[PDB]
Structures are given as structure tokens and as C-alpha cells.
Amino acid sequence: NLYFQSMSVGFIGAGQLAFALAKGFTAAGVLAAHKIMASSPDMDLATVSALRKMGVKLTPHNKETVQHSDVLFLAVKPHIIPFILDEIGADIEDRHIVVSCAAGVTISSIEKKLSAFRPAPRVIRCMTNTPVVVREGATVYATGTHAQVEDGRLMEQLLSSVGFCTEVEEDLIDAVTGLSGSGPAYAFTALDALADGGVKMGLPRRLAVRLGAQALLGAAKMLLHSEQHPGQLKDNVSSPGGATIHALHVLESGGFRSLLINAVEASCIRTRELQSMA
Amino acid sequence: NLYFQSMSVGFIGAGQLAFALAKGFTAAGVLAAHKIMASSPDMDLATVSALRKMGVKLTPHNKETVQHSDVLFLAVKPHIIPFILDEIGADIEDRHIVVSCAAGVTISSIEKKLSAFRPAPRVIRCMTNTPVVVREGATVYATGTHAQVEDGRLMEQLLSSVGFCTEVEEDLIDAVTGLSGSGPAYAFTALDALADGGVKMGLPRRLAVRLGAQALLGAAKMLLHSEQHPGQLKDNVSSPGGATIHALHVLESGGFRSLLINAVEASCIRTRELQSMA
Amino acid sequence: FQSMSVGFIGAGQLAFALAKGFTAAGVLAAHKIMASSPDMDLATVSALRKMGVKLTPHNKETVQHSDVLFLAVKPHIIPFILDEIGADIEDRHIVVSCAAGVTISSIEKKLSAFRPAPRVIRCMTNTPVVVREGATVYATGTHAQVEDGRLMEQLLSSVGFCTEVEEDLIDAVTGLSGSGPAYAFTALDALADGGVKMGLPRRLAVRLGAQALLGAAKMLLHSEQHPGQLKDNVSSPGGATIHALHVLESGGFRSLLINAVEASCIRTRELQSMAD
Amino acid sequence: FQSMSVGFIGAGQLAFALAKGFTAAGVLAAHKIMASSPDMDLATVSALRKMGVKLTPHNKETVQHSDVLFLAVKPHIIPFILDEIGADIEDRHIVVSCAAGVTISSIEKKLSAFRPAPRVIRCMTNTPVVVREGATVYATGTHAQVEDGRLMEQLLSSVGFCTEVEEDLIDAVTGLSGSGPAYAFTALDALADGGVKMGLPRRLAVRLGAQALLGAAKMLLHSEQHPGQLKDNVSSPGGATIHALHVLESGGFRSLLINAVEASCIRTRELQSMAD
Amino acid sequence: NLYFQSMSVGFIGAGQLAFALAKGFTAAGVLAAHKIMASSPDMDLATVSALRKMGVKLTPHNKETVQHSDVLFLAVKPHIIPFILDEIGADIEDRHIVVSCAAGVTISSIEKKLSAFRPAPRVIRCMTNTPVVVREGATVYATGTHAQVEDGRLMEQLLSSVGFCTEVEEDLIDAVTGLSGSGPAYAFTALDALADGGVKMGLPRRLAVRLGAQALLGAAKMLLHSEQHPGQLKDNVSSPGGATIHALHVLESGGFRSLLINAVEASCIRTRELQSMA
Ligand SMILES: NC(=O)C1=CN([C@@H]2O[C@H](COP(=O)(O)OP(=O)(O)OC[C@H]3O[C@@H](n4cnc5c(N)ncnc54)[C@H](O)[C@@H]3O)[C@@H](O)[C@H]2O)C=CC1
Ligand SMILES: NC(=O)C1=CN([C@@H]2O[C@H](COP(=O)(O)OP(=O)(O)OC[C@H]3O[C@@H](n4cnc5c(N)ncnc54)[C@H](O)[C@@H]3O)[C@@H](O)[C@H]2O)C=CC1
Ligand SMILES: NC(=O)C1=CN([C@@H]2O[C@H](COP(=O)(O)OP(=O)(O)OC[C@H]3O[C@@H](n4cnc5c(N)ncnc54)[C@H](O)[C@@H]3O)[C@@H](O)[C@H]2O)C=CC1
Ligand SMILES: NC(=O)C1=CN([C@@H]2O[C@H](COP(=O)(O)OP(=O)(O)OC[C@H]3O[C@@H](n4cnc5c(N)ncnc54)[C@H](O)[C@@H]3O)[C@@H](O)[C@H]2O)C=CC1
Numbered sequence A, B, E: 001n002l003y004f005q006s007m008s009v010g011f012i013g014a015g016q017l018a019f020a021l022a023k024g025f026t027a028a029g030v031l032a033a034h035k036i037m038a039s040s041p042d043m044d045l046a047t048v049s050a051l052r053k054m055g056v057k058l059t060p061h062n063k064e065t066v067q068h069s070d071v072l073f074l075a076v077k078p079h080i081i082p083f084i085l086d087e088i089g090a091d092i093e094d095r096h097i098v099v100s101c102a103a104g105v106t107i108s109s110i111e112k113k114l115s116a117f118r119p120a121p122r123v124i125r126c127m128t129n130t131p132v133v134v135r136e137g138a139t140v141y142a143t144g145t146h147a148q149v150e151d152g153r154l155m156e157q158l159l160s161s162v163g164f165c166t167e168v169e170e171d172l173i174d175a176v177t178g179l180s181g182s183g184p185a186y187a188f189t190a191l192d193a194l195a196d197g198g199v200k201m202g203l204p205r206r207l208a209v210r211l212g213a214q215a216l217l218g219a220a221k222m223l224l225h226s227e228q229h230p231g232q233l234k235d236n237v238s239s240p241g242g243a244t245i246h247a248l249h250v251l252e253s254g255g256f257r258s259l260l261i262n263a264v265e266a267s268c269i270r271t272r273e274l275q276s277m278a
Numbered sequence C, D: 001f002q003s004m005s006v007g008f009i010g011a012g013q014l015a016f017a018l019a020k021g022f023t024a025a026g027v028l029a030a031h032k033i034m035a036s037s038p039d040m041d042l043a044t045v046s047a048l049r050k051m052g053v054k055l056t057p058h059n060k061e062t063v064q065h066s067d068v069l070f071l072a073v074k075p076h077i078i079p080f081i082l083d084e085i086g087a088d089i090e091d092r093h094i095v096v097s098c099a100a101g102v103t104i105s106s107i108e109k110k111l112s113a114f115r116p117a118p119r120v121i122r123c124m125t126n127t128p129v130v131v132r133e134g135a136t137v138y139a140t141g142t143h144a145q146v147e148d149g150r151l152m153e154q155l156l157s158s159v160g161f162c163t164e165v166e167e168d169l170i171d172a173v174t175g176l177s178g179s180g181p182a183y184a185f186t187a188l189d190a191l192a193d194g195g196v197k198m199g200l201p202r203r204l205a206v207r208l209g210a211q212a213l214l215g216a217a218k219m220l221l222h223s224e225q226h227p228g229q230l231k232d233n234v235s236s237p238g239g240a241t242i243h244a245l246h247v248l249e250s251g252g253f254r255s256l257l258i259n260a261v262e263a264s265c266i267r268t269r270e271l272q273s274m275a276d
């Protein structure tokens, strides 16, 4: 149904997130690549070359992206967002849905800037992650003061085409950022280290990478399809006296769990500072 | 459209692994549940009740499993394998392919036991993991002395229906056990801790669990479908000065990578003891 | 079990704890229990006297009175005891060894030199049998009749949890529930110190910490849910509990308790490796 | 207390735990209890329905039914609740706040704007009231009659330990027995992992570890002796237990539990510092 | 042959410290127990029952203690001192010497309270410790603005009967609190741990406790009676290659010395907060 809606989508910013979302949306068949336009003052990026190869329209002029779009994603660094809103705020129209993907930036700050121009800007804040590029993203969104009920449902339909999507209260989004926004990086670090461990124990690197990634994918999928606690799933792998429980002990002795808690906390706290500095 | 109409499968042992594989095989459609039989001296097990509901035939007698089966999975704890082989060795026939899933137990030790009863037993050793239950397992196998080329091909066909499967030299299997065999437990531990971090920062536990698992699944899928190094994918998530690179620093400060190397090593080393004692 | 006579070789902490639990339970009157020790001026001996237990310095007298005979001496003393009373075992006897680490095989070997078919059971229990909340496992020997294991389970269930195990599990049980009360007492003392640091009187802090641990343990015993699921019910988002759990994780709290069970289990095996 | 009607604002974990403990105790029939929550499709709501508790989406209905009204919503929601139902308090009412950190002063301030003399009690309890082994403290407000504190203690004693405290102790109690069950569940999971590492089946390891902690806590509650003296009774010289205690000490085990009580207490105060 | 026949002593507070001092004074023979009175709002205290058995007069009313007493010890918790001074300030007479034992509470704050009722209150501040109960305390005192020279001499005479006593400038007392006031607790902790070490190595607990305590008592006495540096005495016990120097190395490896410095510092710093808040 979204395809026949023939939506025009725009991205202010043409970097990693714009590429990941554009690739996921077109892979999902919801959007035609040429119905997406992205803007950036820097075309010498690999992301821009990849978007061009996809068939996405590219332009240096953010105003052109605004005029083209029905749904406008803000995909620039947090400190760039106020600059962006000053530049194209006069060009936001009643028809637009403005979707901010920027870490930390509040709906209130966005509506404050845009309401100086037209009085009821339709704003949605979201946080997502790069696995939308394989349509396995983890996305949350919050609706602003003037977003219609149909605006939230449209956003959920669009973002559900590239992974999990659910509405939340805005005060949860900084924490989501620390968990699933930054989460793929924690997983890539873990997969690299698990592969090093495989290689230390005699496996070829290529096989160690493949096996570790498949292990993590399958374990995550079991948890998503199970009602059981992750400790109960872990118990089903931990035979008495066996290999797994010996490995779990050395993780515990290093405070493995605490490091992952530290990471979510550190990303969430930094996300809050990215807003305060803007 | 795969289906083994002439294959009768039996499990010696009716525990977690027998349930995971039988559930995966029946979900994949490659085997009808009534062509599978499992034996265990304990029918008051939660996995026996679950196998019964699928339609798997069950018996207390290991000899009946052998007599019913062409492909015979040994799904008992490593120290039980020698008793099992003594019990049913005289019942092994030309048609049997014996597939040992036990951690650490060598092909040579199994062939030596079964050869006392009848020369040329057809033995395959495999290592898999519990995510075969959602058809996302990671499986390796090695062929024994008397396995025919068609036996390994058939086992790869069967095990590929529930996840990744590839042939390896037997001397890699203890290390695979430490990486992908124990791997799901490392992932469950990591997901439990990531959720704790989400809860600390204000997320409801249910949502934190869902988002953490979705982030790990998506990242693993990105790696499996990419030609790039986990570090390059990680670089795409680590914007300069951003939330993610701040979180990655606190992981590095605790030696996060070294803990996962420690874990693979400890599981691999213990697996070799679940045999050197044997 | 109404005409059953019970003896303890050794009149120390465990014999007191079991005899107190047994008599509180009603399953044994104190006058059916005898205990022996070479030192009648002991504190536990004085306590057993007050309860109505019969006391003798002579281990032979304990044996002649007893149907069920508990060995409650230190592990390195078991061989000496078996050499002293071996000629007095009488086929009516069930010999129940409580000593950490000492195998059924080593007991049957010493006793078989005197009479061929000694009925031996090995158990591991803990001091909370004194308030009838012990945790006990037992394994039956080569010549223990089926009714021997059943009588043992009837008796020990009166003072806490009791189940039969294979003998090769008992050293690990020792490291978990045998030593476990000491882990709990250490934890309770530290939790109380934490309460005192934040301004609670010591007596209130001890009471509250102990009541919290008892209640949580009961909750888990009465639940089918994973301990992590019960923990999630207490960890409200952003709240006080999840902040405390983080500082426990950061110190490797879980790993220390794993270390402890392991160290106790390994030492238990060592006590027997050096015995044999 | 036979014509006493009780309400809960909030129908979550604590309301379930208290209502289950109260009805198991016999002190309250389920039909004298009403609970309200904006989400009737909740798991705890479904459980309270099965027990016989009356449920409504409307907090005003809970207030009109109740004599004793428990506030069992998250701390940041208390001010909203008081603004919604303040005009409905009726002088027959005793308002019992269970929320972590929220002071009697802030509750009396919000309610006094509607009617001058609200009868307020603040308590801190824990989830083991669900098996009638909770640990509860309470402090009486400015307008709580003497009989108000006595009725409160009668009710909460039916589900565990209960004593009156000065309000300035309650944040510390929160860090000790309020959060304490989570420390115990974490410890029980780790002790079980230790049992499994040394070869025990998981189900046996969970049962034994939980039984050991329950029994030890009971022993201390029934003793006048210091927790170190009880620990000495388990630490035989050269034995398995003292080897395990050493590895706990070497990891700073005691300090981690002090850290935990402190961190929970401090966070509790912070939740109120940010409220006010 | 010391005895204060004209001195009536009172304690505001009837807890650990009042019991320790009254027991020490009566054991030293310098005061008859019936010339001592103590007040507390709680008679169900174990220290009240003990004071009663010695023959100390007891009352719930602090005003009666003041009216009976010449030397008045304030033996209540620091935050109770201002309430106490408000309650009985109007009852302070020319004859009274007010001796505050409360941690952290300054002479200036006590004189300011009592001066509102009657000018020139005679105030002494002391820090002592529980071993006065065995006449081996460590006590310091500072004299207030209106204390006469004979008041300090008399207090030194009295406090010397239960241990070491010396006059100090008031600004040393918070540090003395961290060293010898809290000191006995460090020693009890050390003795409990030394006994645990003896038990680990095979000693019965009773004997380990006796030997550890005797070793600490003897070593402290050697130092007090020697003109030599604790290091020189330590060198006499550390034979080359021997048992002791091996044990000293493992203490050094854990930073043993730094922990005790940390403790004195933490107690001193907290003591200053038990007043800066006041
Ligand atoms: N990379 C990720 O994993 C995710 C990123 N985000 C958020 O998405 C936003 C962008 O992140 P990345 O795309 O990773 O950054 P990136 O740095 O790859 O791309 C940034 C883009 O913005 C462009 N840009 C700079 N100034 C501009 C201007 N004045 N007008 C238009 N475009 C301008 C840059 O040229 C570049 O194309 C950030 O706010 C980040 O928090 C959120 C979810 C995940
Ligand atoms: N659980 C896992 O994650 C995986 C386990 N494995 C291997 O699978 C084997 C079994 O693992 P789980 O199924 O997890 O064990 P499990 O303990 O869940 O099931 C063990 C089964 O063996 C049965 N059994 C015991 N004695 C028997 C006998 N004499 N004859 C027949 N059945 C008997 C038990 O009753 C139970 O049904 C082990 O060797 C393990 O190394 C390999 C890969 C992953
Ligand atoms: N205390 C505990 O927490 C538990 C201890 N155990 C086992 O119980 C046994 C005893 O432990 P405790 O009772 O704690 O020791 P304990 O030292 O309190 O009592 C030992 C008793 O043995 C007596 N004894 C010494 N030589 C003797 C002899 N030749 N003949 C007779 N009695 C003699 C001593 O006089 C003393 O009364 C040990 O083997 C220990 O492993 C098992 C589980 C729990
Ligand atoms: N869970 C525990 O271990 C204990 C919790 N507490 C306190 O109990 C209070 C509740 O804790 P839990 O019950 O664990 O939270 P919970 O989240 O399980 O239940 C919270 C309930 O409040 C309801 N709620 C939300 N907004 C509401 C509104 N406007 N009107 C009425 N109900 C509303 C929710 O629907 C939910 O049913 C918190 O203040 C916590 O500090 C105190 C001691 C122990």
C-alpha cells in the first residue's frame, strides 16, 4: 500500500544513515530510489557515491530536498540541526512531516525553530540503527505536538518495512540510542573478538567470523521468538561441568555484564550532552 | 523443496539438543515428525513432553531407536557415549550412519567401540548449537573412516535445513565448540546485561530486551551479508565525538575483547578435557 | 521410626544441629539419641545434655545403643573411628557418614574387614537443620537396603530439604549448600554494615537484611520463574535497585560466588585425595 | 479490621504482592480490596482478577471504596495521582505511600490544598510479602492518629516483619531490604552457576542454593549471636568452607554489598531531590 | 592512690561510651559508682542494665544529671548535642565543667549554645575510645575559652586513670578521631581476619583468636616501651629468606599500608562532616 502512495522522501544529509535508510526502503519495495532525494555540501563521500549508484537524486541544496519531499528526514549531526532548521524553516510546508533522526535532539527544540515560520509543524523524532540496510533495524519514534494520528501510523508503516518499529514516549529515546542505536557497534566489537578467539584456538579467520556471526544471529532470533528469560536460554546451553559453564565463568570474572551496562549508560549520557551543547 | 522420504531418524537422548534438532527438522519440512524416534530413560523431562506433542515417537529403549533408524544421532552427554556404544553396538547395521553430536568425543573413540561388534561403522562427528530450533544454527561436521562420500553430502543436506553447515577437518571441532557451540550462551549473557543497561537508563525491561536482541540480530545479519570487515561496519556507527565511540571506549577500558577471547579459549580447552579424561 | 534409636559419634556442631532439629521436628525423642565425644566439658556437649540426649565418652556405647549411627567427626578422624568400632557393627546398623569428602568406598573398605556387608549411607547436610531448614543430599552404599534410603530420607526430610543423589555429586553439594550458610552469614554481615553506613542502627540493619534474604530465598523456592525474572520484578527502570545491581556487577559479584563454590568443592576433593 | 476496605492506586508488582500476601494471611478477603490502573490488559491485573480483587480503570472509584489507600505507583507518578484524587480524600482515609523516596511532607503538602488534615503513612516494603516473608518499615505523618500506626502495623505484620521507624531512616531501609531481594536473586543465580560448573544439574543447584540461604537467614533471625560467630561454626580448620571464604574476601565481596546498599540509598534520595 | 572524693560525675547518654568510661573509672578506684549518674530516654538498653549493676545512679531526666553533677560528660551522638544543650543550658552553673566526647562537635559551637543562658561556660572537648573499659584508652582533650587551668589538669588526672591522656590543640582532634577513636575497629577487623588466616591453616578458632590478639597486644607494647622505629622492630622479626619476610611481601603487594592510611583519612574527613553539616 505504501508503494501505491507514491511518497516522495527527502534526506537532509547524505551520510551513513541516509544511505542505510535509502537502501532498506528500496530493498523493501516501499520507495522507488528515484523518489528519494538527498542533499549534502560534500559530494566526495562514499555514501554519496553509493546513493548515486542506487538511483537516489542528489543535490547540494537543502531547499531542493525540502521542496521535493513529502516526508523529510533530518540526517545530519546533532549540532548541525539548528543550522539546518534556520536555513530551510521558511520552506517547511503544512504538507510536510519532519522526521528528526539526530541523536539527542528534542522535538521541543525542533518545533521551537520551525514554529517561527509556519505555526503547526508536523514533527516526529526517531532513533534507528544501521541494520535497516538489511531490513532488520530497531526503530522507535515519538510524535510531536502537531503530528496527526495518521502521521504516526504512516511513520510506523514506513519504518516497519525495514525492521522492528514501535512508538514510545520521547523521554525514552536517549536510552534507546545507547542500547539499539549504538548497539550494532557493540555487536561488531564482540564479533571481532569472538573471531580472534576462534583464530587463537586454530580456526581460519573466515570460518571464525562466519560461525561467530551465525551464533549471535541465531541466539538473538531464539530470544525474539521465545517467551523465556535469557538466563533460562543460557541454562539450556550450560551442561553441568561442561565447556560452556567454564567459559561463562571467565566472562563473569572479568565483569563482562558490567561492561555492557557501562556502554549503554555512556552512550545514553553522551547523547544527552550532544543536545545540551546544541 | 527438500524432503527425505526414505530417511528414518533416531535420537539417542531426548534432551535439549534432540528437541532443538527435531523441531528444526520438522519446521523445515524435510522430515515428518512421525519418522523421528527418540529414546531416553526419563520420560518426565520437559523436552520429552515437547517431542511427544510434535508427534515424535518415543521409547525408553535405545535398541528400538537403533532398529527404527537409518540416521542415528547420539544426543547424550559426552561421558554417556561409551555406555551407549556398548549397549547398542551389536545392533549397528550396514545401513546406519552414526552422527555424534557430543562435545569433545572423537571419531576414533567411537569407531573403536563400534568396530569391536561389526567392522566399518559409518560415523560422522558434528558440532551444532541450540538455534537450529529457529533454523539459524551453525553446524560443522567431519566424516569418519568408513563414511561414504554420499553420507557426508546427505548429512550436509539435512543439517543445512536448520542453519549454516559446512564440512571441516575433525581437529577444528573442539575450537568450533568453544565459538559457536557455546556461543549462544555468550549472546544470552550479553543480551541480559545490555537489557540491564537499558533498564538503568529508564527503559522498561520488555522493550530493552526486544531492542537489544533486535540490535544483535541486525548487526550479525549485516556482517553475514557484507564483504567488509567488522571494524569497517563498526566505523559506520561511530560518528566523530558521538555517543557510540564514547561507549566503545568504556568497553575497551574493561578489556571487553579479551574477555570474549578468554571465553572461546576456556570452552575449547575444557572440551578437550571432556575427552582426554575419557 | 517409633522404636528407632539414633547415635552420633562426635558431639560437636553438626550433632547438636541435627539432634536439635530432629527433636524439634518430633520425629525423635531426645532419649532415643546418644552422642559420644572424648571431651565431656564441651559447649555442644552441655547443650545436648540439656535437651535430654544421652552422652558417653565411649564410642562403643553409642554403637551398642544405636540403630542408625551418624559419623559426625572431622574427616581425618573417620578412619580412626572405623578402626575402633568396626568389630561392633551388627547388621542391624545403618552407618551414615556426614564427613565432608569421605567416600562410601573408603568406609565400606574399613568396615568390611570386620563384617562383610556394612550398610553405609553418605550424606552432606548443613547447620540450618538446627531450625529445620537444612539442605541435605544422601547416597546409598553397596549393601544399603532399599528401605535404608527411604528411612534416611524420612528422617532428614524432617529437618529440611532432602533428596537422593549419585555419590559423585556430593563434593559439589558440599561446596554449594554445605558451605553455603557461611557465604550467607558473610553477606548478611556486609549488608548490615551497608545499612549502618547509611544510618540504620545495627540491630535493625541485621534484622532487615536477614529478613530480605529469607524472603527472597522463599520466593525462589516457591516459584517456577528464573531468578533473573524475579530480579526484573524488583528492578524498576532508572530506580534504586538497578543502580545497586550495577555496582555489584562492576565488582564481579557473581564470579566471586562461583569462585567460592568451586574452591570449597575442590578443597573437599583434596581432603579425600590426601586421605586415600 | 473485619469491616476494613483496602485500595491500591496502581495495579502492578507491589499491589499484587501485597494483595496476595494479605489474602493468604486471612487478614483481608479479596473482595475488600480494589486496585486501579490505566491498563487493564496487564499481567498483574489479570492475576489480581483471578484472586478475587475488584478492578477499575478509575482511581476515584478506588478512593471511594477504600478506608486504607495504598499508593503503589512509580515515584514520579505520585504527584499526578495526588492532584487527581486530592479532592476525594475524606478524613476516614489513611493514605499509605509505598513509593521509594517520596516524603510524607510532599504528600501532605499536595493533599492539604484540598482538605486540611490528611492522615498519611509512608512505608517501604519488598516483594517477599507475596510469600508472607516481607520486611516492612513505616513512619506516621503529622495527622495520623495513634490507632493509624497500630492498624498499619497489624496489617503489615501479617505479611512479614514490620516496625515503625523515624522517616529519615526509610531511604536507607530502601537500599537494604527494599532492593535486597534483587541482591539475593543475583547471588542465587551465581551460586547455582557455581554448582553447575562443579557438575550439579541446574534445578538441583538452584534448589540447594536457595534452601541454604533461607536456612542461614532463619538461623540468624532466631539467634542472638553475631553473624561472624555463626560463620565460625561452619568454618572448620583447614576445611572447605574457610577456603571458599578466602576467595570471597580476596574479591572484596563484603565491600560490594556495602557499595550496593549505599548506591540504592543514594539513588532513592536522588529520586526525591529531583522530584522536589 | 588517686581518688576524687569531692567530684560528682554525670553522663548525658548511657550508651557504649558512658558504660566504658564509668567501668574504667570505677575499676581504677578513682570514683565510687554511686557518685556517678547517667541519663538516657531508653532504659531497655544493654548498657543501662550494665551501669545499673555497677551501682551507677540512673534517671530518664537530663536535668537531674546536671543538678547532681560537677563534671558533666556529653556522651550522646553528635547530632543530639545541640538538643541537649538547649534542654539543660539554663541549668548550667558556675561549678560545672562540661566535657564533650562527641565526634566532630567543636568547642565554639558548644560555648555559643551555653553562652546564651549564662556567660563563661567551662567546656572541654575530648576524644577517647572504648578501651578505657580495660583502662587502656587513648584520650586527647582541648580546653575551651573559659576553662581554668585547674579544669584541664583535673580532667587529665581523671582521664589518665583509664589510659593514655594528653592535651592537644583542638584542631588536631578530628584527626585523632580517625586514628585512635576509630582505631579499635580497625584492630578488631584485623584480628578477625588474622584468626580466619589461622583457621585456614588448621588452627582452632578459639586458639587463633587468642594468639592473634596476644601478638597484636605484645607488638603494641614493644613499640610503646621502645625508643626505636616500628621498622627497626619489624626488621628484628624478618629473618633473611624466612617466613615473616615472605608474609610481609604479600601484604605489600596488596597495598596494605595504603588501606590503613585510607581508613584514617576517611574517618577524619567524615568526622569533619559530622560537624560542617551541623
Ligand atoms: N550512523 C548511525 O548508526 C546512525 C546515525 N544516527 C544519526 O543520524 C545523523 C547522521 O548520522 P551519520 O549519517 O552517521 O552522519 P554522517 O556524518 O555519515 O553524514 C552526515 C551528513 O550530513 C551532511 N551535512 C553536513 N552539514 C550539512 C548541511 N549543512 N546540510 C546538509 N547536509 C549536511 C554531511 O555532509 C554528511 O553527508 C546523526 O544525527 C546521528 O546521530 C541515528 C541512528 C543511527
Ligand atoms: N545444549 C547445547 O547447546 C548443545 C549440546 N551438544 C551436545 O549434545 C549432547 C546432549 O546435550 P543436551 O541435549 O543439552 O543434554 P540434555 O541433558 O538436555 O539431554 C540429555 C539426554 O540424554 C538422556 N540420557 C541419559 N542417559 C541416557 C542413556 N543411557 N540412553 C539414552 N539417553 C540417555 C537424558 O535423559 C536426556 O534426555 C551433549 O553431548 C552436548 O555436548 C552439542 C551442541 C549444543
Ligand atoms: N559444621 C557444619 O557446618 C557441617 C559439618 N559437616 C561435617 O560434620 C563433621 C563434624 O563437623 P563439626 O560437627 O562442625 O565438627 P565439631 O568439631 O563441631 O565436632 C567434632 C566432634 O568430634 C569429636 N571428636 C574428636 N575426636 C573424636 C573421637 N576420636 N571419637 C569421637 N568423637 C571425637 C570432637 O570432640 C567434637 O565434639 C565434619 O566431618 C564436617 O565435615 C557436614 C556438614 C555441615
Ligand atoms: N517492586 C518492588 O520490589 C517494590 C516497589 N516499591 C514501590 O512500589 C511502587 C510501584 O512499584 P511496582 O509496583 O514494582 O511498579 P509496577 O510498574 O509493577 O506497577 C506500577 C503500576 O502503576 C500503574 N500506573 C501508571 N500510571 C498510573 C496512574 N496514573 N494511575 C494509576 N496507576 C498507574 C501502572 O499501570 C502499573 O500497574 C514504586 O513506587 C516502587 O518504588 C516499594 C518496595 C518494593
Ligand SMILES: NC(=O)C1=CN([C@@H]2O[C@H](COP(=O)(O)OP(=O)(O)OC[C@H]3O[C@@H](n4cnc5c(N)ncnc54)[C@H](O)[C@@H]3O)[C@@H](O)[C@H]2O)C=CC1
Pocket: E012, E013, E014, E015, E016, E017, E018, E039, E040, E041, E042, E045, E062, E074, E075, E076, E077, E078, E080, E083, E084, E101, E102, E103, E127, E128, E129, E130, E181
Ligand atoms: N563508641 C565509641 O567508640 C566512641 C564514641 N564516642 C562518641 O560518644 C558519643 C556516644 O557514643 P556511643 O556511646 O557509642 O553512642 P550509643 O548510641 O551507644 O549511646 C548513645 C546514648 O545516647 C542516648 N540518648 C539519645 N538521645 C538522648 C537525649 N536526648 N538525652 C540523653 N541521652 C540520649 C541513647 O539512649 C544512648 O544511651 C558519640 O558522640 C560518639 O562520637 C567517642 C569516642 C569513642
Ligand SMILES: O=CN1CCC[C@H]1C(=O)O
Pocket: A236, A237, A238, A239, A241, A242, A243, A244, A245, B103, B177, B181, B182
Ligand atoms: O552443553 C552444551 N554445550 C554447548 C557446546 C558444548 C556443550 C558444553 O557446554 O559442554
Ligand SMILES: O=CN1CCC[C@H]1C(=O)O
Pocket: A103, A177, A181, A182, B236, B237, B238, B239, B241, B242, B243, B244, B245
Ligand atoms: O553516529 C552514530 N550513532 C549511532 C547512535 C547515535 C549515534 C552516535 O554515535 O552519536
Ligand SMILES: O=CN1CCC[C@H]1C(=O)O
Pocket: C233, C234, C235, C236, C238, C239, C240, C241, C242, D100, D174, D178, D179
Ligand atoms: O522498584 C523496586 N524497588 C525496590 C525498592 C526501591 C525500588 C527501586 O528500585 O527504585
Ligand SMILES: O=CN1CCC[C@H]1C(=O)O
Pocket: C100, C174, C178, C179, D233, D234, D235, D236, D238, D239, D240, D241, D242
Ligand atoms: O566444617 C563445616 N563444613 C561445611 C561443609 C564442609 C565442611 C568444611 O568446611 O570442610
Ligand SMILES: O=CN1CCC[C@H]1C(=O)O
Pocket: E236, E237, E238, E239, E241, E242, E243, E244, E245
Ligand atoms: O625470624 C623470625 N621469625 C618469626 C617467626 C618465624 C621466623 C621467620 O620469619 O622465619
